[PDB]
Structures are given as C-alpha cells and as structure tokens.
Amino acid sequence: PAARFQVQKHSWDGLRSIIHGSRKNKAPHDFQFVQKTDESGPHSHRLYYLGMPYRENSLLYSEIPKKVRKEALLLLSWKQMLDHFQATPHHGVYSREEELLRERKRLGVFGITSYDFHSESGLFLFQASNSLFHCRDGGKNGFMVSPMKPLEIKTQCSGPRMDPKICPADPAFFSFINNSDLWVANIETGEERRLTFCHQGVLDDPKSAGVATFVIQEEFDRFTGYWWCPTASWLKTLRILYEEVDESEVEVIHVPSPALEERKTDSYRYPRTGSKNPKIALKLAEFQTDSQGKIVSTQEKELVQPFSSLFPKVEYIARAGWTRDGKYAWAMFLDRPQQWLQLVLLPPALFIPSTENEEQRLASARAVPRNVQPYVVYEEVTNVWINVHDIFYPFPQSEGEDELCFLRANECKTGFCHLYKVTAVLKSQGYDWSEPFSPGEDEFKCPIKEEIALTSGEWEVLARHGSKIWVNEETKLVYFQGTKDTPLEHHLYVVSYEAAGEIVRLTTPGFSHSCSMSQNFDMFVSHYSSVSTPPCVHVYKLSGPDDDPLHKQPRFWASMMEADYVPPEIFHFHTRSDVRLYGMIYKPHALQPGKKHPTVLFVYGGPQVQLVNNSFKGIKYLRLNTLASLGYAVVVIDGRGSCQRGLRFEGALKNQMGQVEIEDQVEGLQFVAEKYGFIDLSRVAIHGWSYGGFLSLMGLIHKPQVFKVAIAGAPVTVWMAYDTGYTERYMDVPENNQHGYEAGSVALHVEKLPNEPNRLLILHGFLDENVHFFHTNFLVSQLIRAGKPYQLQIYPNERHSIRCPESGEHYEVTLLHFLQEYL
Amino acid sequence: DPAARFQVQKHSWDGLRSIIHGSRKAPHDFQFVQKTDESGPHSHRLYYLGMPYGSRENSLLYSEIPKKVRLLLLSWKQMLDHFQATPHHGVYSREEELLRERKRLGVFGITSYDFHSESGLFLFQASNSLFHCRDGGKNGFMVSPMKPLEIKTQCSGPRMDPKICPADPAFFSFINNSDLWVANIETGEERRLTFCHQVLDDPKSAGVATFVIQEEFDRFTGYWWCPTASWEGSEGLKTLRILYEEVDESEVEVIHVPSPALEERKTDSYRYPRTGSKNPKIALKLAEFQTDSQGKIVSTQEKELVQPFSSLFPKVEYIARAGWTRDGKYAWAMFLDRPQQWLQLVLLPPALFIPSTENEEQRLASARAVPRNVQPYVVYEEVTNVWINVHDIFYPFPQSEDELCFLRANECKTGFCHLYKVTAVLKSQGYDWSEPFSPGEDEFKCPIKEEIALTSGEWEVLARHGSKIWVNEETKLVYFQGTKDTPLEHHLYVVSYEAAGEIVRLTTPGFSHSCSMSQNFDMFVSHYSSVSTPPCVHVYKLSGPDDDPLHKQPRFWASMMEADYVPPEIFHFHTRSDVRLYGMIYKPHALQPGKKHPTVLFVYGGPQVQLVNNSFKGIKYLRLNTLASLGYAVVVIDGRGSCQRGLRFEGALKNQMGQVEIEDQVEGLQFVAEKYGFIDLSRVAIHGWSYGGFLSLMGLIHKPQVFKVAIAGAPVTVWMAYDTGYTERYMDVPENNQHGYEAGSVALHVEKLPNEPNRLLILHGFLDENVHFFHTNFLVSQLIRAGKPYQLQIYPNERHSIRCPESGEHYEVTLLHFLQEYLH
Numbered sequence A: 001p002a003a004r005f006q007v008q009k010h011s012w013d014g015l016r017s018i019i020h021g022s023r024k025n026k027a028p029h030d031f032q033f034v035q036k037t038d039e040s041g042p043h044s045h046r047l048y049y050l051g052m053p054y055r056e057n058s059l060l061y062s063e064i065p066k067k068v069r070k071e072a073l074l075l076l077s078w079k080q081m082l083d084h085f086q087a088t089p090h091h092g093v094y095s096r097e098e099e100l101l102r103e104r105k106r107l108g109v110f111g112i113t114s115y116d117f118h119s120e121s122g123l124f125l126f127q128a129s130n131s132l133f134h135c136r137d138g139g140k141n142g143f144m145v146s147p148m149k150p151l152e153i154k155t156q157c158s159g160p161r162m163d164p165k166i167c168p169a170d171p172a173f174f175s176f177i178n179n180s181d182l183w184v185a186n187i188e189t190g191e192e193r194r195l196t197f198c199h200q201g202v203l204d205d206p207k208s209a210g211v212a213t214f215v216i217q218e219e220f221d222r223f224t225g226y227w228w229c230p231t232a233s234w235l236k237t238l239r240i241l242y243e244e245v246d247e248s249e250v251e252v253i254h255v256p257s258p259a260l261e262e263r264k265t266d267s268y269r270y271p272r273t274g275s276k277n278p279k280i281a282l283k284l285a286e287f288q289t290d291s292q293g294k295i296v297s298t299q300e301k302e303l304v305q306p307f308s309s310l311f312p313k314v315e316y317i318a319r320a321g322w323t324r325d326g327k328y329a330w331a332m333f334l335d336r337p338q339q340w341l342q343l344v345l346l347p348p349a350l351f352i353p354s355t356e357n358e359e360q361r362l363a364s365a366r367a368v369p370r371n372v373q374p375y376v377v378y379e380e381v382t383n384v385w386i387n388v389h390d391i392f393y394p395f396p397q398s399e400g401e402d403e404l405c406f407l408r409a410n411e412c413k414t415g416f417c418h419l420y421k422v423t424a425v426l427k428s429q430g431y432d433w434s435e436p437f438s439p440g441e442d443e444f445k446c447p448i449k450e451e452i453a454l455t456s457g458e459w460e461v462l463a464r465h466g467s468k469i470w471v472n473e474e475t476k477l478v479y480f481q482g483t484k485d486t487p488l489e490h491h492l493y494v495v496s497y498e499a500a501g502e503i504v505r506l507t508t509p510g511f512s513h514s515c516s517m518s519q520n521f522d523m524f525v526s527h528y529s530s531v532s533t534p535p536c537v538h539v540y541k542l543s544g545p546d547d548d549p550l551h552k553q554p555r556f557w558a559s560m561m562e563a564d565y566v567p568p569e570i571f572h573f574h575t576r577s578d579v580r581l582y583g584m585i586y587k588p589h590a591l592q593p594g595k596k597h598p599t600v601l602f603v604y605g606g607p608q609v610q611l612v613n614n615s616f617k618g619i620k621y622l623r624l625n626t627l628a629s630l631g632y633a634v635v636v637i638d639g640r641g642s643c644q645r646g647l648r649f650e651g652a653l654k655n656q657m658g659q660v661e662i663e664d665q666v667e668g669l670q671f672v673a674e675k676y677g678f679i680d681l682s683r684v685a686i687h688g689w690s691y692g693g694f695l696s697l698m699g700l701i702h703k704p705q706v707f708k709v710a711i712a713g714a715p716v717t718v719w720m721a722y723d724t725g726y727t728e729r730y731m732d733v734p735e736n737n738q739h740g741y742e743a744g745s746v747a748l749h750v751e752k753l754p755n756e757p758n759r760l761l762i763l764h765g766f767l768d769e770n771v772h773f774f775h776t777n778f779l780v781s782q783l784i785r786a787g788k789p790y791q792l793q794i795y796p797n798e799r800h801s802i803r804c805p806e807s808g809e810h811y812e813v814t815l816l817h818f819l820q821e822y823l
Numbered sequence B: 001d002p003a004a005r006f007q008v009q010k011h012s013w014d015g016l017r018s019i020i021h022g023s024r025k026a027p028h029d030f031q032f033v034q035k036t037d038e039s040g041p042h043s044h045r046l047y048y049l050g051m052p053y054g055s056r057e058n059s060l061l062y063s064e065i066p067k068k069v070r071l072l073l074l075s076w077k078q079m080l081d082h083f084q085a086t087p088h089h090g091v092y093s094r095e096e097e098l099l100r101e102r103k104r105l106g107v108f109g110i111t112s113y114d115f116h117s118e119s120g121l122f123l124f125q126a127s128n129s130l131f132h133c134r135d136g137g138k139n140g141f142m143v144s145p146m147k148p149l150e151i152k153t154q155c156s157g158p159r160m161d162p163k164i165c166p167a168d169p170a171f172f173s174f175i176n177n178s179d180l181w182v183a184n185i186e187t188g189e190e191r192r193l194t195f196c197h198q199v200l201d202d203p204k205s206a207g208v209a210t211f212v213i214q215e216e217f218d219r220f221t222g223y224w225w226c227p228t229a230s231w232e233g234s235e236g237l238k239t240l241r242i243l244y245e246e247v248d249e250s251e252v253e254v255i256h257v258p259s260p261a262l263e264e265r266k267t268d269s270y271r272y273p274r275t276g277s278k279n280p281k282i283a284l285k286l287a288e289f290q291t292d293s294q295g296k297i298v299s300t301q302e303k304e305l306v307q308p309f310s311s312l313f314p315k316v317e318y319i320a321r322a323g324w325t326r327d328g329k330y331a332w333a334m335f336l337d338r339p340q341q342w343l344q345l346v347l348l349p350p351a352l353f354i355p356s357t358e359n360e361e362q363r364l365a366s367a368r369a370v371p372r373n374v375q376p377y378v379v380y381e382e383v384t385n386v387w388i389n390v391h392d393i394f395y396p397f398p399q400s401e402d403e404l405c406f407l408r409a410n411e412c413k414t415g416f417c418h419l420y421k422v423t424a425v426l427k428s429q430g431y432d433w434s435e436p437f438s439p440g441e442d443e444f445k446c447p448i449k450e451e452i453a454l455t456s457g458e459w460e461v462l463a464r465h466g467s468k469i470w471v472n473e474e475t476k477l478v479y480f481q482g483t484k485d486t487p488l489e490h491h492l493y494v495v496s497y498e499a500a501g502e503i504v505r506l507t508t509p510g511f512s513h514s515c516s517m518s519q520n521f522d523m524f525v526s527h528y529s530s531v532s533t534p535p536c537v538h539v540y541k542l543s544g545p546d547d548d549p550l551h552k553q554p555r556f557w558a559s560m561m562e563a564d565y566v567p568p569e570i571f572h573f574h575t576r577s578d579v580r581l582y583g584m585i586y587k588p589h590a591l592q593p594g595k596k597h598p599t600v601l602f603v604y605g606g607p608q609v610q611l612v613n614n615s616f617k618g619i620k621y622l623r624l625n626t627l628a629s630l631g632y633a634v635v636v637i638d639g640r641g642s643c644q645r646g647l648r649f650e651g652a653l654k655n656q657m658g659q660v661e662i663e664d665q666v667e668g669l670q671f672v673a674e675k676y677g678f679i680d681l682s683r684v685a686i687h688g689w690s691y692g693g694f695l696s697l698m699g700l701i702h703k704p705q706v707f708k709v710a711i712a713g714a715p716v717t718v719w720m721a722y723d724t725g726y727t728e729r730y731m732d733v734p735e736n737n738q739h740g741y742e743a744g745s746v747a748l749h750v751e752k753l754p755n756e757p758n759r760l761l762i763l764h765g766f767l768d769e770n771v772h773f774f775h776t777n778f779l780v781s782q783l784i785r786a787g788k789p790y791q792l793q794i795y796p797n798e799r800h801s802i803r804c805p806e807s808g809e810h811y812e813v814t815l816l817h818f819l820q821e822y823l824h
C-alpha cells in the first residue's frame, strides 16, 4: 500500500552528484616513545610516529611536555621530520614488488608506510621514492627543532631493495632483500655485501632467500623471511636467521599486468588448495666486521641435518626470531592441516657451513657438540584449526640454563586466546650429528615444568594482526589488549605475570581503543572511537606510587587528534540454537514510522573479520550512510564464523563454508524486521565484496524468496581455485571434503540462480591476484551454459579492492542505480 | 501517435529462450576425375568435402557422374568407413585451432586435403595425426568405403600443412615445430630440412605463414614444392626442391592472450605486430633433397639467395604470395612494401640460390661460382595512391625463352580488377654475384613487351578469398567469376585470352553462384542461391561443337543438392553525393500498414566484406529473421568502404575509418523510412560484431539522437592496439595519421557516449586473439573515468566469433531482452 516507502528515482548524472557530494587521512600510528634525558628542558618525551596531515603519510614527531595547566586541554603539534620530502614515487606508481606488498598489507595510503628505528643511535631507516633513505634524531646525535632532509643510501644494486632493517647489535649496518636474496651494507662506509645466492638469471629461477612467499604473506600475516640476531659475538661476528625457499614444484598462473597497453601478464607461484607449497628451510648467514667497519668475511650455514628430516611434519614457517641474548634462534612451525603448532629453539651451533665437499661437511658435523639440539618448548593442538597468534616473549635465562620461561598466547587450550606463563625444561639427550637419523614424534619435546593461566574467561586476548603485549620486567606486569569488557570494544589491560590475580583496565568504556605503550611504561597512546563519535588520539600518563604498579592510574595528558552522517545502532539477538549474535542497523534518514523501507543486507561473513563492533564506521563505510540518506534500511549481521568470539564460534564454518552463514543472516534480518518497525521484507537486496560477494551469491542460491537482488563483488566461486593456506585450514584438502567444496562453490549451483534478469550484478577487479578474475569468468561461463541472465562490471585497473577514487565513485553510482531500478 | 507505434510483446527471459530455441530447431573443395572406361556407365567420379545432414562432421565424399540421363539427384558416397576425423569433443591442438580461426572455419572433420591425380592419393589431417587413402588412377575405383591409413611419425606435436610432392607422389611435406620436414609415404622414412627451431628465445621458423600474413593477407602456407624433379649429380640421384620462407620474429612485440584451459589460469604468448611496430624479419630460402631409385632420401641441403633478401629487395616488407612456374625453371614471389602501395612479381632462378654456410670463405667461392647471367626478374610492378589489395590470379604460361607470357588480375590500372595478358622481356644485365651489391630503383624491372586487357568495365573479376580462374590452353579460353551482370550476383564467364572479344556468361541470372571448373573443361559445378531461395548444387556439362569452344552451352546434367522464414528485400538508393548504395530490409512479419515499428540497423561496414547481395541469408543471418518475427524492422546498408564495387568505392575509408560509414548508414536509414512507411525513427538500434561493433559505438558517439541504443560486440576501440597489415593499409602508420587514429578510436571519445544508462551493451569474447579483450577492457576503463554507464557480456570460452551453440543462443536471448526492455 502507501506503507511501502519508494526511493526517489534520479538520473545517472543525478546519482553521480549525490555520490560526489557525499565524498566532498590516517591518524598517527607506528609510534616510538623516546625519553629526553634532560632535567632542565620543558619536554619529558619526544614521540615519533607515522601520520598524514590534513597529502601523504610521513615521519612526524610531537613534544610531550613536563607539565600541563590541566585547566585547558593540551593539543600536541605534529612537527615534520623531513624538510619538503616526497616519499611517494612519481605519479604514485610503485614497483611490482612494492605494490604487491602494499596489497598484501592492505595499505591504501601513500608515502612512508613503515620504518625501522634504532633507539641508541636515533637512526631511522625506511623505503621512500623507489630507494632507501635515512635520518638521525635523538640519542648521541641530539634532538632537532626543525626538519632535516633525509639522505638517500646509494647502491650498486638494480631493482628495488625491499624489507630494510637496522642491525640491532651494530647500527652501522643494515640489511635488505634484492632479487630474492639477502644483502647487508654499512650506512657509514657505503659497503654492500650479498649473503645468499639462490637467484640467478622466472620459471627458470625458483629459489629465494630471506623472502616471505605469497601464501605466507596473504594467509599468515608474515611479510619477512629473515631476522637479525640481536647481539654480536667476538673481529666481531653478526648473524641473520633466514628462510630459504624453493617454489619449483608450485603451480604457476598468469595474472594481467597493470600496464594494460602492454597486454601482458605476470607469472605467480600460486599454491592452489591440494597441491605443493614451496619447499622451505631455516638457514643462517654470518659475516665478520673489523673495528673500521669493513666486512671481512661472510658465510652461508645450514642445519647439520636437513630441516626436512629434523622436522618431517612441518609445512609452513609461521614466525621466527631470536632470544634477546642471541643464545637461541626460534621458529613457530605448522603442519599442513594447520592443526599442530610447535615453538622450536634452534641453537646457532646446530648450524654448520654449507659446502659441496662431503668430507668438509662431515668434519663440521663431527665437530658439533653432542649436547646441542633443537628444543621444542611448546606444542598447541586442536580439532578445529590453529590460528597463528603472535605473542611469544622469552625471558632471559636468569635461573640458569636447562630451563626457559616464556609468556605465550594460546587459544586451543580453552577455546579462547589467553596469556600463559610457561617453563620448559631443556635437557640435552645427546646426539651423533655425524650419523643421519630420522627423529620420531615428540623427539625434541621438552617437559613442561609449569604452565600458569594469566588470564581466563569467555573472552580473548588480542594477539594477531598487529596486536601485541608489553612486558615490564622490573614490575613483573604484562600489558595487553582484549575484549574482556565486551566483544564490541578493544581495551587495554594490565595483569601480573608473577602473581596472576587482578586484571586492571586502563582505557575508558564506551569506546574501542588502539593502544601503544612506552617501553619505559610511564605513558601510552590510545587511538579510539565509538559508532557515534569520530576517532581521537590521546596521550595518557601512568601516575601513582611506585610501590603499587598494578594500580597506576592513567591520567589524560594531551591530545594528538580530535573531533550528513547518522551513526548506526548496535543490537543483539539470540538464534533458534540460543547463540548471541550482534548486529548493526543504519535507519533510514527522515524516517516516518509506519513506512516499510527497502533494505540492503550488507555482508562479509567469513573468518578473521568482525564488522559489528563499537567503533566509528563513517570513514570506511560511508556508502552505507549514503544508502540510508536515500531511504534504504541497511543491516549488518556478524554471524558464526566471524571473529573476536573465540574458536568454537568461528569453528561453526569448519568444512561447510557457504552453508551456515546465510541462516544467521536471515535470522538477523527477520529479527530486525520485528524490533525496528521499518523493514520491507518484500524488497531486500544482498550485497558484499570478497567473502561478502561469495555470500551474496549463496544468499540468492539458497534464499531466493528472501533476497530480491544480489550485488556480488570479487567473489570466490570455486574453492578448488583458491589457495592452500586459507582453504585447507577451514575446508580441509579437496580429497577429504568433496561434499563441502561442492556445496560451497557457487559456480557449481548456477541452476539454482534466478531465471529472472536484473536480480544478479557481478563485479570484479581485472588485475585481481588474490581472488583471480577467473572466479567471475568461470561463473559467467556456467551461467551461460545454464541459460541464466547476469549483469557484469569490471574494474580494469583494480586488484582485489577498488582504490582509485573515480572507480570507487563509479562503483557506488552503479550500486545506487541497480537498486533504484530493480529492488 | 499511440496506436501507430507498434509495441514488441515483452516476454519473460525463459520465454525468450524458448523462442530462440524454436527458431534454430554444402559440397565443396572438388576434384573431377575422368573415368577412362568406354563400357562403363559413369563418365567421371567427382570427389569433394561435405557434411551429410544426418552426419555430424565434414568428410571426404564422392558422387558418380553418369554417361547419359533421361531430374537426376546424385548419391553422396562415403570415402572413409565409419571414421572420426574430429578429435575428442572437438578439441584441436593450439596450432590447428588457431589456423581454424584464421581460416574462419566453423565445421568439424576434414576441412582440407591434398590430392595427386596420377596416383589417386589423398592426403589430409584427421584426429591429431595425418591420414591418407588411395582411389582412382593406377589403384582403381572403390565401390565401398575404405579405412584411411595413418602415417606414423617419430615427431612430437602436430604435423601441419601436409602436401604431396607433385613431381613424386611417394613423398610429402609438413611443418613440425616451426620447421620443414619431408617423408616418403611408401617407406615411412622422415627427414627434417630446416633448423630454425630448437619460448621467446626461439623466434625463428621456416615454411610458416606468421599471424598477420594469415589474418591480414590470406596466405596459410610458407612453403611451395617445386613441381618438377631434376637429374643432376655424379651418379643417378633425383633432386626435389621446396621454396620456403624463413622468418625471424625477434624484434616483434609479444602479447599474452588467455588459454582456453580456463582452469589452468594461463595465457599464450603471441608475436603480434601492432600498427607502427616491427613485422618479422623475412627471406626466401630454397631446400633441396636427393632420392635414390628405391625412394631412400640420400641427402638434403639448406640454400639461400647469393645476396641478402634485404639487399636485393630492400623495400619489401611482406611476401604476399609465391610459387613456381610449371616447368620449375623459375620460382616466383609477390612482394609488398610497408605502406602496401607498391607490389612486385619477381622470378627467382634456382641457380640464384647458394648453399648456406657460416664460413665466410666458402660463401664467396659459391657466390663467384654463380653464373653472371643469372638474376631476379621483376616481370610486374603495380602501384596506387589508395592501397594494393592482394589478388591471387597469376598464371605463367610455358615458355616458347628471353620472355614470359602470363595472365594477371590487376585492379590499380583502371580501379577495377580485370584480367590482363602480359609479356615481359627477360634480358640479363650481367652481375658479379661475389661483390657486395646495392640495387637501383628499377634494378631488375623487366620491360613489358605487350599488355592486353582481357576484360574491362565498371565491374570486377573475382581474384581473392578462394576465387580463381581456369585456363584451357588447347582452346585459348580463360574461365572466371565476376560481377559484370550485377554486383549482387557472382557469375561464371568465359573469354578468349588469345583473342579478347566476347565474354560469355555460363550461369543463370537471378542467383549468385560459387563454381568449380573441371581441369578437362568438359564439366563444371555451381553452388548457388538467391535471397528468396536456399542454396543448390548442380552439375553442368559444357556442350556444342568443338569448332567454337567459346560458345559451348552449359546444360544441366544433375543435382547434388536441392533446397517461419521470410526473405529480406534488396533495394538501392542514391546518396546526396550521387553514389548508389545497396540495402536490404527484413519487413516485420504480419505487417499492418500504418504501424511504425522499432528498427535494428544491423551493421558491419568494414572493408573486405559485402552484406547486401543476392544470395541466401537465412543460414548465417537467422537472428535477423527472428527479430522480424517479433516485430522489429531490420535494415542492412552497404556503405562506402565495402567491397565488390572496385577500389574507389573502397577508398573513401582511406585514413578516416569511423568518419564516413555512419553517414551512409544514416542516409540509408532515412531513405528506407521514406520508401517503406513502417520504420519508427524514434526507436532505432544499431548493432554489429567486429567492424560492426566499432561502428555501433561510432553510431552512438556521432548520432546519439538517431540511435537510442547500441549493442557492440568484439569491437576495436583503439587503432594503435590493432595490427600492422590491416591498419597500416587503410589508416597509415600512427605517426603519419594522428588525427585519424584519434577521430577513429572510440575509446578516446567516451565523453561523447551517453549519460543515460541502458543505451549501450558491450559484448566481447575473453579468448579473442584478433581483437584482443583489451579493446573492451580499455573502453570500460575510459567509460569509468568519464562516469559513463555501460552493460557488458563476456564470452569466456570464445575468441573473435561465438561458435559454442549454448553461448550463441544466450547471445541472441540477451539481444532480444536488451531490445525489449530498453529500446524506446
């Protein structure tokens, strides 16, 4: 009747102006806290950070003062580090390597997106333009009051120098990756030295060193393949643990180059579900320097026995690094089903020089002490899957050798991620490293002396995707981030790692916080917001008696950032299996109760993402507000398989992706229809990108009477065509889950898609190297065979995401027109 | 105006599917073998390729032509017993599938074959191997089908372009891995003759026509058997010769097109010369081999021109054609410069070729050795201000020395393709083949003794795309096809090459004929049809006294083939510049005068094609009849630039592609509006594929108030992305025609496209290796930048043309829906 609200129909030009009007920069992040060391001065700290003032991301600093009036709020000035410097390459065009890493990192912003910092010398090291640059501030060099030009580091290399890092033991040196091999150089003398020789004169050249391969980067959130030893030994020797990789047996596929006029593709090693991942191993590279800084010698070392024989079950190296004294290297290992993890200590003496000579090799093997061996200090096991959590803090071995104390984030134990203090017993069995042997199961398993829960409950410690802990050893406290208060807000917490009792929250409720702690534990920064309020960045001092450190009171010190949008509203309901799901609704603008409005169910719905939480959405999800301003109801549901709710909630997806997610979405939709008076269930569109697109198609397949149209972007339509890392973890290998692979692949159910045109819009970025355009291509193929209608939009200069603003606007205008006309 | 406007009934998608499904629910490549039995009842056996209607694929067949008749319908007899020539699920090798595209070959099975008349030996490609069978001559005529014999090989990969050695049928040749091979069919012995091949580090090949030669110059071979054997050496060895083209693609651009193995997610590399970019480096080489009495291949030799091809013929960019004289005294080549405005017919004496050696010293000796009188002879040179179309007619007569008499099809002389008899004088200047040689502007240009026009007038002899002449030397008559009667019909004519007087037509008017003439000139076949009648295939016997062979009467001997569709109507009109253009209309079925109907202007409009002529359109253009049955008027105009109207008609395109054609189309549309009163000019849609998609986009760009919607398929949107052969011929090099490349490139005029959605539907095959998907991908890129709506349909398992019926049906269903919903 007249109850049905009708969206105003605009011309295309009209829609373009509306979208253009709606859209007519990244808050400080990546901080370094530095104490001044000057009682006379008016500043206690200098805070260094990356940020973008109201053009490009750049290195910046603020001065933290010694006293504030406290009658008024103090706003800190963003001072430029560099004087009129452009870090973005000309026309924002990066090399294939640098552009692919921005993709893997989901980096949109231009300029300096990472940097290294050496505290003692005040040395900053970073990629800029298509080269390497550096500058010095603080420490022995002293604190500038105005910007200084960064100095380009000269190289006789060709191609980009990737993943640069300062030597922690000696800031005269630094490392980088050039043409799939490891290099080192001395900033002070300009001397360059290559340490690995896996690359030659690229189906022909399949070996690399120091490099994280595609799946490692896309599916394991590791972007480096090497790790500086934190100390030197005495000439003086320096060390680098590194992953050596061989992709020969890995499948090659071709994706189109951004240079469209060239009409060429790029080749990738793409391990599709069910076939070979690269062959990998951990190696060690040494090099000696004299007192003048000259690189005297270098050496390539390998495990005394093959890595494949020592660790037969290991499929991926998730993480690596060293103990703080440089005693032991360490590596986090994973099996192919991703159900068994191992933290392993590799003592350096375990590694011997590589040589072609079998005699020399046996001499080096005989020489290795019998008491040197791998130590498997930890092992996590599960029936679902092992999420890679990044927390692992080895304490120095003060209580002598033969034991190792560390903190560890474990989720498999109780089903949620919590902190544990662990003491593993290192007891050398004694080995004949000269004779080869095949180690069995639990061959290097350390007995666990003790294992204490530091945190517990129906909630999780944040330990993935940049989340970290801060451990103060004087006070025996561990600072961390979590959902203890609620799954919709991230908060900062402190708890004793000595006496695991009271967890104390340091962040204010109502808001979700992104925090950085000073290494001196005297102050932290919180970048936070709510659904109703734009984000701010405040500086908090921890004040109180030094005899009660757990109860330091965080006191607001200063602010670094502050602030036709209508915020959405968070709600919750329970499913017909009594599971609590959260949701979000954008109500139509100028709502008139009694009207039923057309509705857009905006969806993602896969693992590792939570859309519904209490933080500001107006930046990333402006289009959803735009839809609301035209008078659409917009509904977002976080169904089972979504994250921040523990393994068992996420685990509802196991081996049946596509099957569980829509029900929760349909439940949520029906709930919203009762609660809020304003949903017309006769006019409901489903729409998402990536996992969201896959689900938009499943929604139309399985629930055609509920969803009138689907707008599906960048979808995965054939699970056999997706990679190993992601697919096998949640769906098993295809040989072991034909039912799920088939039931979850939308391209194989195309008969179930509609006979009515205008109900399915497909969208996909032609350059997509993650969800290959093949997915859309194969779906149309099958749509054609089944005699089904479709509409299609291509983004020819876009990969998985749309990043060019004009393409984005076109995307939003198209979406508005499709809905206007056909919903 | 409400009642007047006819409204197409709007169907559901499934309804449209049933309509397309309901709607969709000949002999060629002949050999006339004379049967030499007086008592028998059959004068000849006629061998040919054909698809029986019951049969799934093309196959080698035969009919028996009887001695006397009393309406005879001849049986199609199977040559091969229950043989599948199509490989599994019609899946050819990349090499054979790309050659099928280049040849525009739709049908499955045996698409070509070689035949040696004396031995009665047939040689052809089948499965993914080579097959052969024997019939007639010394073998004898079979009465029942015979299983074909496979030819075993040590080679790996496909054996392409098989040809029987004319001088000795025991031998045959083929291309394996970009090199020329020969083999003795009787002994099964194989022998490789070139070594250009050993991916992108292997750019040399031999005996092979490269992409552009194939796609743009209608040559599918790069080797040519010498037709006569030789008998020179120490002790009784027999020498056989093959002329061939060596090619070096090094400096030619590489592009990647996706593989038909979609699930592989890979591409193929292609040497694709874009306009203005480098073509392969070329030369002509000679390969000889010697055989003993037992048919063993004793030796082989790689030979080459005593002087570089690039110094002897410095202006030559493309080898259009080549071959040998019938006595094997000279090899010949047709050459073309890069602008394709200068052609040369050149005779290459075999003695002009010396064995190839890396040794500097040996080459000098062999060069010195070459006789001083030996040289190339440029017997013909053709020049023009427009472009040289390549004409296949060149018939050298046997010599009876010091001159060469030949027939030539020439278009540049008068502006129309006509037959000429030419006598060129061969007089040797004398050259030191040892010294370096740099030639003058007319170094080997033979004087022309005489040059006679055998045909003349405002009409053309057919000399391209399979058209050819037949020359009977006893009677002095040349037989050919032409548009002399009218440009809408192909007819068979006979004129004397001895005495150029009366041209006699042998085909019946009212139809367009495709004819094959017997080598004995006693019998001929015509495959013909009209706009209103489906094709037929009749056998005609030439009769009359031998006193006046020019005046032999064709007499119907027998038929090989006989016979809601409503044919279209041909019409003609005159432009405001007083040019006569032909058109075609399909009237809406069950038309009610006074109604105004929505109209589809179906277009192509590019050179080398003519849509409007008097022949059956029902097979190829069924969809246009389906449109008419729904109530659309469908119009087709042959505007300036189209073919079979001579060079100057075609020449109006020159360096302004996209600029002239639409005017002729619009004139044509408005004309049809006045004559027939059933066209609603407020509802006109433009649609075509290939050149027609390019024009559909130009129609909407330049005439947005004339065309409400455009449906463009496989279009070229940026001329810079297109190849050298086609583009440079009609549009010059990009550095010499920046205005025209820019005005003719639809992707650069995207601002001019509409602001209203549902006015433009773009279609393109993902696997297109001719008009790369890039073109559409680039237009979408530009559309997005300009903020312009578009719809788009991809054919993922399809190159330039849609061949999977499942996809074809979907394409039509999509078209009807687009028209129904958005044409208003």
Ligand SMILES: N[C@H](C(=O)N1Cc2ccccc2C1)[C@H]1CC[C@H](N2CCCC2)CC1
Binding pocket: A218, A219, A465, A606, A607, A608, A609, A689, A690, A691, A692, A694, A714, A715, A716, A726, A770, A771
């Ligand atoms: N490899 C995955 C991917 O990009 N996918 C695309 C896609 C599209 C359709 C169906 C499934 C998939 C999986 C990504 C793994 C990391 C995850 N991040 C979110 C916040 C931090 C970690 C996002 C997904």
Ligand SMILES: N[C@H](C(=O)N1Cc2ccccc2C1)[C@H]1CC[C@H](N2CCCC2)CC1
Binding pocket: B215, B216, B465, B606, B607, B608, B609, B690, B691, B692, B694, B714, B715, B716, B726, B770, B771
């Ligand atoms: N290479 C050309 C082609 O395929 N083109 C596609 C296309 C699309 C848009 C704009 C221009 C072009 C040119 C074809 C050359 C051979 C010719 N044949 C017709 C009958 C016998 C010869 C047809 C054209």
